[PDB]
Structure formats: C-alpha cells, structure tokens
Amino acid sequence: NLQDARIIIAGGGIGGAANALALAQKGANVTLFERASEFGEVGAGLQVGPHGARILDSWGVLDDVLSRAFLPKNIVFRDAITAEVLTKIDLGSEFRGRYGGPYFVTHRSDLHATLVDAARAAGAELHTGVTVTDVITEGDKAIVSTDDGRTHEADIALGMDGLKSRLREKISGDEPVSSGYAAYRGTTPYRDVEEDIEDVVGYIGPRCHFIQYPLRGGEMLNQVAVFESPGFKNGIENWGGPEELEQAYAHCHENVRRGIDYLWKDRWWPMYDREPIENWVDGRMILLGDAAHPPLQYLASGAVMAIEDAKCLADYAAEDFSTGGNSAWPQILKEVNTERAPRCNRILTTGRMWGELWHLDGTARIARNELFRTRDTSSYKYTDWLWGYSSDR
Amino acid sequence: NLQDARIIIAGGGIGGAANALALAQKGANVTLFERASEFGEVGAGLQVGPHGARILDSWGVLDDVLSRAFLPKNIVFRDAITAEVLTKIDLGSEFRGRYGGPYFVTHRSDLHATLVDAARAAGAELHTGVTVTDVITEGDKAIVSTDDGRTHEADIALGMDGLKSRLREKISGDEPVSSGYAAYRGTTPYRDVEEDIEDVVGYIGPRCHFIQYPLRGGEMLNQVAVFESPGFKNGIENWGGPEELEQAYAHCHENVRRGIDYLWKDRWWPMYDREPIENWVDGRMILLGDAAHPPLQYLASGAVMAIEDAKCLADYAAEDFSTGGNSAWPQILKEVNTERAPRCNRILTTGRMWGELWHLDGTARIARNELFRTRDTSSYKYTDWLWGYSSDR
Ligand SMILES: Cc1cc2nc3c(=O)[nH]c(=O)nc-3n(C[C@H](O)[C@H](O)[C@H](O)COP(=O)(O)OP(=O)(O)OC[C@H]3O[C@@H](n4cnc5c(N)ncnc54)[C@H](O)[C@@H]3O)c2cc1C
Ligand SMILES: Cc1cc2nc3c(=O)[nH]c(=O)nc-3n(C[C@H](O)[C@H](O)[C@H](O)COP(=O)(O)OP(=O)(O)OC[C@H]3O[C@@H](n4cnc5c(N)ncnc54)[C@H](O)[C@@H]3O)c2cc1C
Ligand SMILES: [Cl-]
Ligand SMILES: [Cl-]
Incomplete structure (x- = not known):
C-alpha cells in the first residue's frame, strides 16, 4: 500500500x-x-465503456454511478443523409462477459461528483x-x-x-492542434424531442456527425452535433459559432436536422488534440x-x-x-x-482516423457504408484493443 | 432472319x-x-468478360479467338503502395458455369481482325x-x-x-467529359520484365492504378498505367504526357514503379467519357x-x-x-x-464510381482496402449485374 x-x-x-x-x-x-x-462538471452526457466501468467497480463506486446512469442496448451507426442503419455494436450479454463490465452513459457532473465524494471519503x-x-x-x-x-x-x-x-x-x-471541427451539446427532456431511442445512436455524414443517447431512466436525451467549421478554414479566431450549424447539416436527413434545434447555442467546444x-x-x-x-x-x-x-x-x-x-x-x-x-x-x-472515417463523402462514403454493413458482428477485432485493455501485471 | x-x-x-x-x-x-x-486495332491487350465471350461463341468465333488469347485464373487487386493482395475474383470453374463463358484477354488487333474476317465470310x-x-x-x-x-x-x-x-x-x-486521368500501355516480352503472373493484376493506389496481364501463351506481358494528370488541372491542352509518369507513381511500391519503364511513351490515351x-x-x-x-x-x-x-x-x-x-x-x-x-x-x-474507389487516399483508402479484404468471396452480388446480363427475350 x-x-x-x-x-x-x-x-x-x-x-x-x-x-x-x-x-x-x-x-x-x-x-x-x-x-x-x-468542484463540478458540465451537466451533459459522457460515455464510459467497460475499460472505464471495470475500474470504477474496483474502486467500489460503479454500483452507485449506475444508479444514476443509463444502460444502452447497442451503439448504432446510421448514415446521416439517409438515416439507414449501417451497423450495431451489441452491448448485451456477450459484450459484458468479454470485457468485464457494462458500456454505460451518464451525466459528466454526476460521475465527477461521485468521484470527488469517494476521494474525500477515502x-x-x-x-x-x-x-x-x-x-x-x-x-x-x-x-x-x-x-x-x-x-x-x-x-x-x-x-x-x-x-x-x-x-x-x-x-x-x-501547442494544441485544431481539428477544424466544433462540438455542440444539448440535453432535452426526452418527451419534448420530436422512433424511441434506447441506444447510443451516431448519425455519420459528410463533414459532420450527430449523436443521441438517453440519460438516467430515459428522462432526458443527450444530443451532440460535431461538424466541420468553414470559419476555421477561413481564419476566424472564435470559429465554430452557431451561425454555422444550419448550413453544416443542410444535406442531412430530417432526423438529424431537427436535432440541431435542441442544442445549447450559447457555448460550444472547438475540438483540438495534441x-x-x-x-x-x-x-x-x-x-x-x-x-x-x-x-x-x-x-x-x-x-x-x-x-x-x-x-x-x-x-x-x-x-x-x-x-x-x-x-x-x-x-x-x-x-x-x-x-x-x-x-x-x-x-x-x-x-x-476513426473520426475521418465517419466524415467521408462521395465514393469514400459508399465504401465506408458497405464496410460497416457487411462486417462480422461476432468478431471483436476492431474493439478488443480498446475495450479489452488492462494495465494489470 | x-x-x-x-x-x-x-x-x-x-x-x-x-x-x-x-x-x-x-x-x-x-x-x-x-x-x-x-482495318486494324492497337496491338495491345483488352479484357473480355463472359458477357462478351458468350456472344462471340454464339457467332462461332470464340474458339478461334481463344486459340490466340490468354485465360487468366483470377483478377487480383493489390494495394499499389504496399503490394498487399486485397482480394481475388476467381475466374475458375464456378465463375464460368455461372456466367456461361470464360473471362479472357487478348490483343485488340487479333479480336478486331477475327471479327472483320468472320463478317466478310458471312x-x-x-x-x-x-x-x-x-x-x-x-x-x-x-x-x-x-x-x-x-x-x-x-x-x-x-x-x-x-x-x-x-x-x-x-x-x-x-461534348466529351474529361476524367483528368491518362492511360499508357505497353507490351513487353514476358521474359524481359523484372513473381510470375498468370492473372489479371490491378494495383490500385492514390490517384493511380497499374494493371498487368499476360497475352497469348504467356509470351508477352500487357501493362497499363492510369494516373491523375496534374497538367489537366493546370490547363494544358495536350495533357497527360510522359513527363508526368515518374511523379505520378513516386509513392507506389517498387513493383509498380519498375513497371513504368516498359510503357510505350510516344502515345497515350487521355480518358474521357460522356x-x-x-x-x-x-x-x-x-x-x-x-x-x-x-x-x-x-x-x-x-x-x-x-x-x-x-x-x-x-x-x-x-x-x-x-x-x-x-x-x-x-x-x-x-x-x-x-x-x-x-x-x-x-x-x-x-x-x-468504381474508378474513384480504386484511386482513394488516406482514411478512405484504409476503408476501401478492408472492404475488399473482408468480402464474401462466394457472393456474386457485386458482379451479376455486369457479367450475368443478357439481352435475350
Ligand atoms: C465534446 C466532448 C465529448 C467528450 N466525450 C467523452 C466521452 O463520452 N467519454 C470520455 O471518456 N471522454 C470524453 N471526452 C474527453 C474528456 O472530457 C476529457 O478527456 C477528460 O475530461 C479530461 O480530464 P482531465 O481531468 O485530464 O482534464 P480536465 O477535465 O481539463 O481537468 C483539468 C482541471 O484542472 C483545473 N486546472 C487547470 N490548471 C490548473 C492549475 N494550474 N492548478 C489547479 N487546477 C488547474 C481545471 O480547472 C480543470 O478542472 C470528451 C471531450 C469533449 C471535448
Ligand atoms: C485505355 C483503354 C482501355 C480499354 N480497355 C478495354 C477492355 O479491356 N475491354 C473492353 O471491352 N473495352 C475496353 N476499352 C473500350 C473500347 O476500347 C471501346 O469501348 C470500343 O473500342 C469502342 O468501339 P467502337 O467500334 O464503338 O468505336 P471505335 O473503336 O472508336 O471505332 C469507331 C471507328 O469509326 C471510324 N470512323 C470515325 N468516323 C467515321 C466516319 N464518319 N465514317 C466512317 N468511319 C468512321 C474510326 O476510324 C474507328 O475505326 C478500353 C478503352 C480504353 C481507352
Ligand atoms: Cl474523448
Ligand atoms: Cl472500357
């Protein structure tokens, strides 16, 4: 110790x-x-795969976090233009057995508070x-x-x-490297969003994507819109603002376009990494x-x-x-x-590379859609590196 | 009649x-x-799938054409950067039974002469x-x-x-629509090309491809290089000339780069359709x-x-x-x-769309390679529309 x-x-x-x-x-x-x-975090969703869930269980806080979380049945990829289902990752009984925990979603604020309370307790x-x-x-x-x-x-x-x-x-x-893409979030009472959603749904389209998932007991829907900012290319310092959202989604299916109206428009997250x-x-x-x-x-x-x-x-x-x-x-x-x-x-x-694969257009989009459709859904080769890792020695 | x-x-x-x-x-x-x-045609290869071969057999000229043709065992797609085999279309016994004839390759000049001689005879x-x-x-x-x-x-x-x-x-x-790509051909004695080839091989790379196949009895190798012409974009009237070939292939595997040296350089085919x-x-x-x-x-x-x-x-x-x-x-x-x-x-x-799929780069190339690798090689859904058509009513 x-x-x-x-x-x-x-x-x-x-x-x-x-x-x-x-x-x-x-x-x-x-x-x-x-x-x-x-202490605090954004009152919007995050996703925590079994590579995080197993660790929270070790620290004895998973049960508690789960009491205020949502357990999606699948991650569903859909084409953002046609709304066609491309593929699902089943998060059910085979997955949890393989990876030693659930894939769950919860409010960032709740996970952070639960960690801070347990840290203090300890x-x-x-x-x-x-x-x-x-x-x-x-x-x-x-x-x-x-x-x-x-x-x-x-x-x-x-x-x-x-x-x-x-x-x-x-x-x-x-210095941080700009992706040229911006993220918006929203959380809406589930009933007010204009069929039913019990999964993490990702609509993937040319130069954009749109994600939906329910939060605790299905009462709220979390929505996330990420799109390529023309302002970034054009040199704006505060690029990615909400005047860009309508045009960025104008080629998408109605299910995606309707979603834009629910996002918080007073704050956004220009996406950088290093x-x-x-x-x-x-x-x-x-x-x-x-x-x-x-x-x-x-x-x-x-x-x-x-x-x-x-x-x-x-x-x-x-x-x-x-x-x-x-x-x-x-x-x-x-x-x-x-x-x-x-x-x-x-x-x-x-x-x-994975975000670039989501945002393909033209013939590259036709190839990507068929690759997702035709895959071996029993194979874990695309995911074991991510969800099956452990630092245990 | x-x-x-x-x-x-x-x-x-x-x-x-x-x-x-x-x-x-x-x-x-x-x-x-x-x-x-x-009468005459270019003394270089063409490919004739079973959608043409069945028709020549009906006219009673297939046997004769085949006596001076080559019967590849597969169409093999390879990545032009790594030379990795991506997939093969087997042209063997299942294929010929399904489509009612062989996929063969021969000299354009020989097919054309055989047609002209039979037309005269008739x-x-x-x-x-x-x-x-x-x-x-x-x-x-x-x-x-x-x-x-x-x-x-x-x-x-x-x-x-x-x-x-x-x-x-x-x-x-x-008017004809320019593709912005140019084609070169070569035919070389098989022995002089610098392992062995018994198939139609297509190396598919960013902004280019390179095809090889043997001709009658494997004595000559037919080689075809198609690449995106920077001169076309830059406005040249006689775009696609041979000064562009080295640069257009400089990112490819040695097997592809060595091929460029065998092409006829005194004539080329800027590619247009309508x-x-x-x-x-x-x-x-x-x-x-x-x-x-x-x-x-x-x-x-x-x-x-x-x-x-x-x-x-x-x-x-x-x-x-x-x-x-x-x-x-x-x-x-x-x-x-x-x-x-x-x-x-x-x-x-x-x-x-199919040529665009060959010429993808970046993440789109990674997606296309995996789509070709993982396909159901027993399924004919990508090819029946092409090789299984008949006008018979
Ligand atoms: C749109 C979006 C969606 C995301 N979705 C997910 C998801 O679904 N799942 C997932 O796992 N991750 C997700 N992430 C990533 C995740 O948000 C971050 O990787 C993670 O929050 C980083 O945590 P951190 O504690 O390292 O840093 P931060 O969260 O940045 O915390 C750093 C803290 O340090 C404090 N601070 C800064 N300087 C000082 C200083 N000098 N002294 C003291 N305090 C300081 C700051 O106030 C802050 O509280 C997402 C990120 C984005 C942008
Ligand atoms: C690089 C390349 C590779 C190809 N590979 C293949 C392949 O593997 N397999 C395949 O099936 N196809 C292939 N093709 C396509 C094939 O070459 C053509 O589709 C086919 O040759 C067209 O034949 P055609 O008789 O309709 O026209 P053409 O071959 O153009 O013949 C037209 C003829 O009309 C003559 N002519 C023109 N105007 C007149 C006039 N007013 N009066 C009288 N005569 C006239 C011309 O001299 C010419 O002989 C390829 C094409 C290219 C460019
Ligand atoms: Cl993240
Ligand atoms: Cl053609």
Missing part, C-alpha cells in the same frame, strides 16, 4: 478526482488543488480555489507552488491540468489525463484514459513503494509512463 | 465489325464504311478509306452520304463512329458502341458493350422484321434502344 507516501495533484477534473480516489484508497496522503472555486484532502503555479523537483521530493504564495513538499506531483496544461511546458513546447508524446515525466512530476494525452473525442475515451491512468499509477505504486519506499518513485513514474503512453497514443492517433 | 434487309454501318471499329458480323449471319445485306485506309461488304459525312431519314429509308460524293439507300443506318462521333450531333450537342443519354435513335439511324455510350475503362466493358449491342440489334431485328418487314424497323430500333440504354448507362455511371 501507500501510507507514508505523499502525492500532490494539480487539477481536479475527472482525471485528478479519479487519481485522488485511487491513491487515497491505497492509504497514501493526497493533496489535490483545483483552480475553480467549486481520505484525500481536496482544495478548491487554488491554482498550482509551478512544480520543480529538488533531491527526492517535488516542490509545488500555489497562487497564495505557499510551497508544498510531496514525494511526487501529478500534472492533471487538462488540454491547456501549463505544467506540460516543462516537458514539451507543443500530437502524441512518449515522455510524460519531469523528475518527480508526471503528466496524466488530458495534460499528457488529450484526444479528439471520436472514441469517447478521454475521461476513461484519465481513469485508467489513476488505476495504473496507484496499482504500480502500491506494488513498488511497499518494498522500495520513497526512493522507488522515479522508477514507478517511468513504469507507469511506459505502460500508459503506447495505449493512450494509439487512442490519439487511431481516434483521428 | 434478315434477307431483304439492308443496313449501312458508319465505322469499322470493334463495334462496327461485330454488328456487321451479327447482321450478315442473319442473312441481311450489310455495307460498312470505315474512314481509315486499313457476306458483309466492308469498305476501307471511306468516311460517312451524313445520314438523314427520308420516308422509310436512311440515306447515307460518303466523302466520294455518293449517296446510299438502306433500311437503317448504324452510327458507330466512336467517342468523337459526329453522327451523335444529330441527337445531342454534348454523360449518359437515353435516346440513341434519329429516324432510321441508331447510335451504337462508343458513339452511344463511351465509358471510362474501369469496368473493361466498352468493346464488350458494343458487342452486346450487335447481338441485341441482330436478334431483335430477326425476330420482328421476319413478320413485319421494312415497316418494322423504327419499332425494332426503339426496342433495341430501350433494352440497351439502362444497361449501358449503368456501366457508364457505375464505372465512374
């Missing part, structure tokens, strides 16, 4: 919260600093309204600076400050979550990768610190980086 | 020759005018060095003008003057062959469609003229047009 260990976590998103939980359950001393004045010391302004390594400790003028000593620090990480600048000078990097470690600081590996969201696995990062770090640390103490930390960070970077950088790079 | 019938054919390519044969075997009086001073009067300058219909006859100042009366005329048909101007003012048109009839003149329906050559069926045109016209004419005489000709031309236009215009339009 981790009793004499001290860890400081910079950032309290889903990643930082899950690391706080996993390390405090091992008996470590955890201090987490979150810049925002309250002993983690969480602080809101505090920004980490620096992390340096001196001798065998990390020295962390906060925006109240204080400094804090720990054995290691986690840089979990997101896609716009400033801690990442210690290791890499790269090129993959191999090394995430600077002395006794490791970058994790989106600060190490921010993806485009086509594989719905960004938060799941931050959860897997938490599991791997706490499991490999408990194994090695038990017998090697504080001196073992730089070897533990190396081993965690070596396990996690190939996994997560394959999600980054394959995710980019 | 056709004994009192008179037909004049404008053009003596493979189309005009095959119509002369089919009509003279029915006992019709056939006069064919060819502009060139000698009674057709062939004339070289004579251009048809006009065709008009007056009463119940076609009146055909030639470039020696003479006029000729027949019951019907066939406009078979090719892709650049001037007779087509009677019916449509359209938009499909429904009506091919002007009074007692019908356009047939490339004058009615010139394709891009991705389905290797242009000459085969002209052969099918010959079979349909002679069969439907023999059926109706037997009992209705000369007065039946305009109804016969209508019925032939109504049978042949949907068939041939589907080859035109599907052929364009």
Whole structure:
C-alpha cells in the first residue's frame, strides 16, 4: 500500500478526482488543488465503456454511478443523409462477459461528483480555489507552488491540468492542434424531442456527425452535433459559432436536422488534440489525463484514459513503494509512463482516423457504408484493443 | 432472319465489325464504311468478360479467338503502395458455369481482325478509306452520304463512329467529359520484365492504378498505367504526357514503379467519357458502341458493350422484321434502344464510381482496402449485374 507516501495533484477534473480516489484508497496522503472555486462538471452526457466501468467497480463506486446512469442496448451507426442503419455494436450479454463490465452513459457532473465524494471519503484532502503555479523537483521530493504564495513538499506531483496544461511546458513546447471541427451539446427532456431511442445512436455524414443517447431512466436525451467549421478554414479566431450549424447539416436527413434545434447555442467546444508524446515525466512530476494525452473525442475515451491512468499509477505504486519506499518513485513514474503512453497514443492517433472515417463523402462514403454493413458482428477485432485493455501485471 | 434487309454501318471499329458480323449471319445485306485506309486495332491487350465471350461463341468465333488469347485464373487487386493482395475474383470453374463463358484477354488487333474476317465470310461488304459525312431519314429509308460524293439507300443506318462521333450531333450537342486521368500501355516480352503472373493484376493506389496481364501463351506481358494528370488541372491542352509518369507513381511500391519503364511513351490515351443519354435513335439511324455510350475503362466493358449491342440489334431485328418487314424497323430500333440504354448507362455511371474507389487516399483508402479484404468471396452480388446480363427475350 501507500501510507507514508505523499502525492500532490494539480487539477481536479475527472482525471485528478479519479487519481485522488485511487491513491487515497491505497492509504497514501493526497493533496489535490483545483483552480475553480467549486468542484463540478458540465451537466451533459459522457460515455464510459467497460475499460472505464471495470475500474470504477474496483474502486467500489460503479454500483452507485449506475444508479444514476443509463444502460444502452447497442451503439448504432446510421448514415446521416439517409438515416439507414449501417451497423450495431451489441452491448448485451456477450459484450459484458468479454470485457468485464457494462458500456454505460451518464451525466459528466454526476460521475465527477461521485468521484470527488469517494476521494474525500477515502481520505484525500481536496482544495478548491487554488491554482498550482509551478512544480520543480529538488533531491527526492517535488516542490509545488500555489497562487497564495505557499510551497508544498510531496514525494511526487501529478500534472492533471487538462488540454491547456501549463505544467506540460516543462516537458514539451507543443501547442494544441485544431481539428477544424466544433462540438455542440444539448440535453432535452426526452418527451419534448420530436422512433424511441434506447441506444447510443451516431448519425455519420459528410463533414459532420450527430449523436443521441438517453440519460438516467430515459428522462432526458443527450444530443451532440460535431461538424466541420468553414470559419476555421477561413481564419476566424472564435470559429465554430452557431451561425454555422444550419448550413453544416443542410444535406442531412430530417432526423438529424431537427436535432440541431435542441442544442445549447450559447457555448460550444472547438475540438483540438495534441500530437502524441512518449515522455510524460519531469523528475518527480508526471503528466496524466488530458495534460499528457488529450484526444479528439471520436472514441469517447478521454475521461476513461484519465481513469485508467489513476488505476495504473496507484496499482504500480502500491506494488513498488511497499518494498522500495520513497526512493522507488522515479522508477514507478517511468513504469507507469511506459505502460500508459503506447495505449493512450494509439487512442490519439487511431481516434483521428476513426473520426475521418465517419466524415467521408462521395465514393469514400459508399465504401465506408458497405464496410460497416457487411462486417462480422461476432468478431471483436476492431474493439478488443480498446475495450479489452488492462494495465494489470 | 434478315434477307431483304439492308443496313449501312458508319465505322469499322470493334463495334462496327461485330454488328456487321451479327447482321450478315442473319442473312441481311450489310455495307460498312470505315474512314481509315486499313482495318486494324492497337496491338495491345483488352479484357473480355463472359458477357462478351458468350456472344462471340454464339457467332462461332470464340474458339478461334481463344486459340490466340490468354485465360487468366483470377483478377487480383493489390494495394499499389504496399503490394498487399486485397482480394481475388476467381475466374475458375464456378465463375464460368455461372456466367456461361470464360473471362479472357487478348490483343485488340487479333479480336478486331477475327471479327472483320468472320463478317466478310458471312457476306458483309466492308469498305476501307471511306468516311460517312451524313445520314438523314427520308420516308422509310436512311440515306447515307460518303466523302466520294455518293449517296446510299438502306433500311437503317448504324452510327458507330466512336467517342468523337459526329453522327451523335444529330441527337445531342454534348461534348466529351474529361476524367483528368491518362492511360499508357505497353507490351513487353514476358521474359524481359523484372513473381510470375498468370492473372489479371490491378494495383490500385492514390490517384493511380497499374494493371498487368499476360497475352497469348504467356509470351508477352500487357501493362497499363492510369494516373491523375496534374497538367489537366493546370490547363494544358495536350495533357497527360510522359513527363508526368515518374511523379505520378513516386509513392507506389517498387513493383509498380519498375513497371513504368516498359510503357510505350510516344502515345497515350487521355480518358474521357460522356454523360449518359437515353435516346440513341434519329429516324432510321441508331447510335451504337462508343458513339452511344463511351465509358471510362474501369469496368473493361466498352468493346464488350458494343458487342452486346450487335447481338441485341441482330436478334431483335430477326425476330420482328421476319413478320413485319421494312415497316418494322423504327419499332425494332426503339426496342433495341430501350433494352440497351439502362444497361449501358449503368456501366457508364457505375464505372465512374468504381474508378474513384480504386484511386482513394488516406482514411478512405484504409476503408476501401478492408472492404475488399473482408468480402464474401462466394457472393456474386457485386458482379451479376455486369457479367450475368443478357439481352435475350
Ligand atoms: C465534446 C466532448 C465529448 C467528450 N466525450 C467523452 C466521452 O463520452 N467519454 C470520455 O471518456 N471522454 C470524453 N471526452 C474527453 C474528456 O472530457 C476529457 O478527456 C477528460 O475530461 C479530461 O480530464 P482531465 O481531468 O485530464 O482534464 P480536465 O477535465 O481539463 O481537468 C483539468 C482541471 O484542472 C483545473 N486546472 C487547470 N490548471 C490548473 C492549475 N494550474 N492548478 C489547479 N487546477 C488547474 C481545471 O480547472 C480543470 O478542472 C470528451 C471531450 C469533449 C471535448
Ligand atoms: C485505355 C483503354 C482501355 C480499354 N480497355 C478495354 C477492355 O479491356 N475491354 C473492353 O471491352 N473495352 C475496353 N476499352 C473500350 C473500347 O476500347 C471501346 O469501348 C470500343 O473500342 C469502342 O468501339 P467502337 O467500334 O464503338 O468505336 P471505335 O473503336 O472508336 O471505332 C469507331 C471507328 O469509326 C471510324 N470512323 C470515325 N468516323 C467515321 C466516319 N464518319 N465514317 C466512317 N468511319 C468512321 C474510326 O476510324 C474507328 O475505326 C478500353 C478503352 C480504353 C481507352
Ligand atoms: Cl474523448
Ligand atoms: Cl472500357
């Protein structure tokens, strides 16, 4: 376990919260600093495959999360022009047996709160309204600076400050790479959306897609529209705004076009990722979550990768610190980086190809539709790398 | 049959020759005018699927053509970058039984000569060095003008003057549509090409393809390179010249790049087709062959469609003229047009999509390769429309 260990976590998103939980359950001393004045997340959906669900079950929080989640029966791909069903991924009894957990969807806000509550329950010391302004390594400790003028000593620090990480600048000078696509969300009472949906449905079209799924007990429908922004190509600084939505969907089926009207129009998410990097470690600081590996969201696995990062770090640390103490930390960070970077950088790079496959047009769309139609639905070769991974050694 | 019938054919390519044969075997009086001073065709390969082979067998010329042809065992698609085999179409015993004949390849010159010799044997009067300058219909006859100042009366005329048909101007003012791709050919002694080939091999790559097949007894190898011409986009009048070949293949596998060196460089074929048109009839003149329906050559069926045109016209004419005489000709031309236009215009339009499918790049290429790999090789759904058609009623 981790009793004499001290860890400081910079950032309290889903990643930082899950690391706080996993390390405090091992008996470590955890201090987490979150810049925002309250913990919280967007009150809209996310998807959590069995690669995340199994981990939450290990931490004893899956049952609880599921009480406020929705269990879709399938992921259904449809053509966005014709609305034709192309293929389904069955999330039923064969899938859960293979992958050791359900594929579920829930509100981001609920998952994040449940993680923060369990982290606190397990002993983690969480602080809101505090920004980490620096992390340096001196001798065998990390020295962390906060925006109240204080400094804090720990054995290691986690840089979990997101896609716009400033801690990442210690290791890499790269900048976010624009995809040129923007995401909108909406959540609507299910009854007010204009047949019935019990699945995650993805309509995939030229230069756009549109996703729908129900949330807890089917009361609300989550809707997500992602489209190629002409403003990005044309050089706009604040590209992707809502004046682009009608034109971006004008070639789609009525089921998709009607959906646009339900989206929140006052906020959107221009989609960026970063090129993959191999090394995430600077002395006794490791970058994790989106600060190490921010993806485009086509594989719905960004938060799941931050959860897997938490599991791997706490499991490999408990194994090695038990017998090697504080001196073992730089070897533990190396081993965690070596396990996690190939996994997560394959999600980054394959995710980019997978979104391009959704957004094909012309003859390439005709080929992609037939490839999805004719596949062997009993084969798991397209998914085992993603949903069957485990860091267990 | 056709004994009192008179037909004049404008053009003596493979189309005009095959119509002369089919009509003279029915006992019709056939006069064919060819502009060139000698009958002849390019001494390079063509492919003739069972949709053409069955027809030649009916006319009693298949055995003879086969004596000087090559019988490939498969059509093999390979990726032009990696040389990976993607899929094979087996041309063996299941295929020939299904489609009623072999898929063969031979020299264009040999097929054309064999058709011209059999047409002559059957009674057709062939004339070289004579251009048809006009065709008009007056009463119940076609009146055909030639470039020696003479006029000729027949019951019907066939406009078979090719892709650049001037007779087509009677019916449509359209012009050839450039594909922006150019074709080169070569034939090399098989032994001099730098493993062994017993199939039709198509290497399909971004913005290009490369085809190889052996000719009679495997003595010569036919090679065809088709690539997207940057000169066409850039506005050159005589675009597609050989200075473009190296760059156009520079991303391909060595097997493809080595092939370029064997091509004839003194002549090439900029690839054009025409938009499909429904009506091919002007009074007692019908356009047939490339004058009615010139394709891009991705389905290797242009000459085969002209052969099918010959079979349909002679069969439907023999059926109706037997009992209705000369007065039946305009109804016969209508019925032939109504049978042949949907068939041939589907080859035109599907052929364009099929070449685009070969020339995909990026994620669209990854999708296309997997679609070809994973297909049901026992299913004929992609090919029955093409190789299983018959005009028989
Ligand atoms: C449209 C969209 C849909 C998505 N859908 C899914 C999905 O279905 N499933 C999935 O698994 N993932 C999904 N993701 C990805 C997922 O949202 C992210 O990968 C994940 O939230 C990253 O978590 P994180 O904790 O690493 O970073 P963040 O969530 O960015 O958290 C970083 C935190 O650090 C705080 N902070 C920043 N700087 C400092 C500092 N110096 N000091 C202290 N605090 C700091 C920030 O306030 C923030 O709370 C999606 C992403 C997008 C954009
Ligand atoms: C690179 C390439 C590869 C191909 N590969 C294949 C293949 O493998 N299989 C296949 O089936 N098809 C293939 N084709 C298509 C095939 O070549 C043509 O569809 C077919 O040759 C057309 O025959 P046609 O008789 O209708 O016209 P043409 O061959 O053009 O013949 C028209 C004839 O009319 C003559 N002429 C013109 N004007 C007059 C006039 N006013 N008076 C008298 N005579 C006139 C011309 O001199 C010419 O001989 C390919 C085409 C290309 C470009
Ligand atoms: Cl994601
Ligand atoms: Cl052709």
